[PDB]
Structure formats: C-alpha cells, structure tokens
Amino acid sequence: VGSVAALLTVVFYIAAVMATNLYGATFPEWFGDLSKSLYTLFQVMTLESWSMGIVRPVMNVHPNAWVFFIPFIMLTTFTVLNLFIGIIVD
Amino acid sequence: VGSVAALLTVVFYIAAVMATNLYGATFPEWFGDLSKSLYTLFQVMTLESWSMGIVRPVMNVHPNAWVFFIPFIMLTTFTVLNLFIGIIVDAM
Amino acid sequence: VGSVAALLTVVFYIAAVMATNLYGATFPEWFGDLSKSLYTLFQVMTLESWSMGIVRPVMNVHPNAWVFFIPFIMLTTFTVLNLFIGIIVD
Amino acid sequence: VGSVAALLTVVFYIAAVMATNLYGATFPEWFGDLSKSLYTLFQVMTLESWSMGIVRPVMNVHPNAWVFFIPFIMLTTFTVLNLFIGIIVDAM
Numbered sequence: 371v372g373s374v375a376a377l378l379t380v381v382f383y384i385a386a387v388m389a390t391n392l393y394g395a396t397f398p399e400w401f402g403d404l405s406k407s408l409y410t411l412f413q414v415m416t417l418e419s420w421s422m423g424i425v426r427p428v429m430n431v432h433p434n435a436w437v438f439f440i441p442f443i444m445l446t447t448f449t450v451l452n453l454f455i456g457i458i459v460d
Numbered sequence: 461v462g463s464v465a466a467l468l469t470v471v472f473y474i475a476a477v478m479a480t481n482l483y484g485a486t487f488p489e490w491f492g493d494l495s496k497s498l499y500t501l502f503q504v505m506t507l508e509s510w511s512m513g514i515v516r517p518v519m520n521v522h523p524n525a526w527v528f529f530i531p532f533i534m535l536t537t538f539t540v541l542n543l544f545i546g547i548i549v550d551a552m
Numbered sequence: 553v554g555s556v557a558a559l560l561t562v563v564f565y566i567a568a569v570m571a572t573n574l575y576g577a578t579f580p581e582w583f584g585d586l587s588k589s590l591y592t593l594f595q596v597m598t599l600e601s602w603s604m605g606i607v608r609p610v611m612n613v614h615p616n617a618w619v620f621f622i623p624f625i626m627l628t629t630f631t632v633l634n635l636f637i638g639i640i641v642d
Numbered sequence: 643v644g645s646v647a648a649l650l651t652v653v654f655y656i657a658a659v660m661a662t663n664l665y666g667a668t669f670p671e672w673f674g675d676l677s678k679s680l681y682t683l684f685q686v687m688t689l690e691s692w693s694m695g696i697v698r699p700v701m702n703v704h705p706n707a708w709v710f711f712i713p714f715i716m717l718t719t720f721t722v723l724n725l726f727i728g729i730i731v732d733a734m
C-alpha cells in the first residue's frame with residue numbers, strides 16, 4: 371500500500387514536470403511552473419473540467435495532447451482507486 | 461478480464477462509429493470524424509460536461525439523443541468498473 | 553438486486569414527479585414536464601453541473617431547493633452504487 | 643460505521659466554520675455564512691466545479707487556498723467512501 375503511494379507521487383511529479391515543459395509557454399496559467407502543473411493534474415485526476423475546461427483548449431494548440439492526458443487519467447484514476455481500496459481491505 | 465477489455469473496445473468503437481454518422485454533420489467539432497467521436501465518448505464516459513457541455517446542445521437538434529447517450533453511459537460506466545475490479549481480484 | 557432496481561425506479565419516478573410540480577413553472581427547460589425532469593435528475597445523479605449548472609440557479613428562486621436535491625443525491629448516488637456492486641458480487 | 647458518520651459531521655462542521663472565517667468576506671455568495679459554507683463544501687466534496695467554478699477563483703485572492711481544499715477533498719472523498727462501504731459490509 372505504501373509502495374503504491376510512492377509510485378503515484380513519482381508518476382505525479384514526473385507528469386507535472388512533462389506538462390510544465392510541454393504546455394507551460396502556451397498555457398502559463400495552468401502549466402507555467404511545477405506548482406501550477408501539480409495543481410492542474412490533481413484537478414485533471416479528479417476529472418473536473420478535464421476535457422471542456424482544460425484538454426480541449428490545450429488540444430487547440432497541441433493536437434496530440436490527448437496522448438498525454440488520456441493515459442495520465444487512466445493510470446492515476448486507477449492507482450488512486452487501488453491505493454484507497456488497499457487501506458479499506460487492511 | 462481480457463475478454464472484458466475486448467468487449468469495451470468493440471462497444472467503444474461501434475458507439476464512436478454510430479455517433480460520427482448521427483451527429484457528425486450537425487456537431488462537427490465533437491463528432492466530425494471517428495477520432496473526435498472516440499475522444500468525445502471517452503469524456504462522456506468520464507461524465508465530464510456530458511449533459512450541459514455535450515448532450516443538452518445535441519438534443520436541441522436531435523431530441524432523442526438521450527436514447528443513445530444515457531444507455532451508452534449506463535453500459536460503459538459499469539463495464540469500466542467491472543474491467544478495473546477484474547484486475548484487482550486477479551491479485552487476491 | 554432486482555428489488556433494489558425496483559426501489560430506484562419508484563424513487564426516480566416519484567422524485568421526477570415532485571420536481572415537475574415544484575420547479576416546472578420557474579425552470580421549464582429543466583423540469584417543465586416529467587420527461588425533462590427524469591432527464592435532469594439522471595444528470596443530477598451523475599453529479600454533472602448539479603450545483604453550478606442546476607441547483608444554485610434553482611435556489612436563487614426556491615432557497616430551500618437543497619432539501620430536495622442534497623438528500624436525492626445522497627439516496628440515489630448510494631442505491632445506484634449498491635445495485636451495481638450487487639451484480640459484481642453475484 | 644456510526645462513529646464514521648460522527649467523524650464526518652465533526653470534520654464537515656469545523657471545515658465549514660474555517661471556510662466562513664477564511665473566505666466569507668472575499669467570496670460571500672459561496673462562504674458568507676455557515677449555511678452557504680456547508681452547501682459549498684458538500685459540492686466541493688462531490689467534486690462539482692471544485693477547481694474551475696470554486697477553488698481557482700478563490701486562489702486568485704488567497705494563493706494558498708489549495709492547502710485547505712486539496713486535503714479537505716482527500717479526507718472527505720475517502721471518509722464518505724469508507725462510511726458508505728461500512729453499511730454495505732453490515733449486511734454481509
């Protein structure tokens with residue numbers, strides 16, 4: 371369970387690094403620094419305005435942004451559900 | 461578990477085909493090709509702006525669009541829960 | 553499991569009747585007939601724009617609308633989760 | 643299971659008190675009294691417009707508001723899942 375939380379932190383930090391690099395210049399309010407990026411990716415994980423509010427406006431500049439977000443959603447919104455269920459069984 | 465993923469892909473591809481045909485001309489930004497349709501239906505599945513952002517604007521042109529989306533939501537937002545639980549059991 | 557689905561249909565139909573009566577005149581696009589009401593309450597159940605998009609605009613006319621929606625959400629977004637989990641265990 | 647519901651009520655009431663104090667003057671429609679605050683925090687819990695609709699506009703005045711909401715979400719959107727699962731087990 372602890373190793374799952376360690377995996378998620380590593381995946382969340384690396385994805386927030388990638389997004390800062392990728393969309394930081396074009397979308398500075400959402401990904402202009404590591405902080406804004408970790409915040410945005412937590413919101414994207416909770417699925418709040420992920421497509422309409424974030425990903426569709428991004429894809430308008432970077433047409434392949436879905437290659438990042440869709441797997442990011444699928445990975446985190448699974449590992450989070452796995453980590454949370456893990457403590458419930460314990 | 462693998463058969464569940466195979467079922468979802470088939471259902472997702474066929475639904476994305478149907479939507480492209482149905483709403484592609486009237487709503488081309490959301491369903492104008494298979495790609496835009498698979499993207500939109502993934503978002504509809506995640507329940508993000510499904511009614512306000514997508515389905516209500518669609519229903520304004522096609523009043524019966526709910527016959528497509530509501531069952532699509534009920535089917536996928538169950539099969540996804542079934543597929544994800546399936547791998548979890550494959551550990552215990 | 554079947555009795556759970558029968559309970560939800562009864563609760564969903566009665567709540568859609570109540571909403572048509574309560575907010576049908578003031579909010580006719582969302583609750584102007586039984587059909588629009590069953591549609592809106594399915595969306596409210598999925599939690600999509602429930603507060604910002606629906607309930608906050610309603611509460612602006614009917615300040616106690618939260619006495620309807622909040623319990624409706626708590627009841628359905630539990631019974632649905634119970635009904636769906638029921639078949640998974642079977 | 644009952645102790646879980648008692649824990650959530652205490653956490654929900656104290657969080658609604660904190661928010662009224664913190665953002666009540668700057669954001670009075672959402673946190674201007676305890677009532678508006680308990681309503682907003684129920685919506686924040688359900689994840690409805692939490693960031694775009696509530697937290698991002700708040701952070702524009704209080705840049706650290708995420709220190710309140712993010713843990714609040716993590717705590718409630720876990721304790722609610724724990725409380726709901728608790729009654730389900732009390733049958734099997």
Ligand SMILES: CCCCCCCCCC(=O)N(CCO)C[C@@H](O)[C@@H](O)[C@@H](O)[C@@H](O)CO
Pocket residue numbers: 382399405406408409412701705706708712
């Ligand atoms: C799952 C792990 C989730 C971790 C989430 C951490 C989010 C951090 C958000 C954040 O810090 N910012 C987002 C901005 O949108 C930047 C500013 O809020 C911050 O820099 C200020 O506090 C001051 O330093 C400057 O005013």
Ligand SMILES: CCCCCCCCCC(=O)N(CCO)C[C@@H](O)[C@@H](O)[C@@H](O)[C@@H](O)CO
Pocket residue numbers: 429433434436440472495496498499502
């Ligand atoms: C559960 C399964 C989830 C499947 C998700 C698949 C999403 C595919 C989305 C997609 O391919 N596009 C979305 C468009 O909205 C179009 C892209 O091909 C885009 O790169 C185009 O713009 C190019 O022509 C280059 O400009």
Ligand SMILES: CCCCCCCCCC(=O)N(CCO)C[C@@H](O)[C@@H](O)[C@@H](O)[C@@H](O)CO
Pocket residue numbers: 519523524526530564581587588590591594
């Ligand atoms: C969990 C159970 C969920 C059941 C959901 C059923 C929703 C039915 C929605 C509905 O029928 N309408 C919603 C309108 O917003 C009315 C119109 O769509 C309908 O009357 C048209 O099909 C034509 O008759 C007139 O053009």
Ligand SMILES: CCCCCCCCCC(=O)N(CCO)C[C@@H](O)[C@@H](O)[C@@H](O)[C@@H](O)CO
Pocket residue numbers: 611615616618622654677678680681684
């Ligand atoms: C998990 C626990 C969930 C608790 C949810 C409690 C919600 C309570 C919301 C509430 O009381 N109001 C929301 C306001 O946004 C104010 C009402 O008292 C309203 O009726 C007022 O307008 C009156 O003064 C009459 O006009």
Ligand SMILES: [Br-]
Pocket residue numbers: 443444447506540
């Ligand atoms: Br998903």
Ligand SMILES: [Br-]
Pocket residue numbers: 533534537632
């Ligand atoms: Br559902």
Ligand SMILES: [Br-]
Pocket residue numbers: 625626629688722
């Ligand atoms: Br809830």
Ligand SMILES: [Br-]
Pocket residue numbers: 450715716719
């Ligand atoms: Br979470």
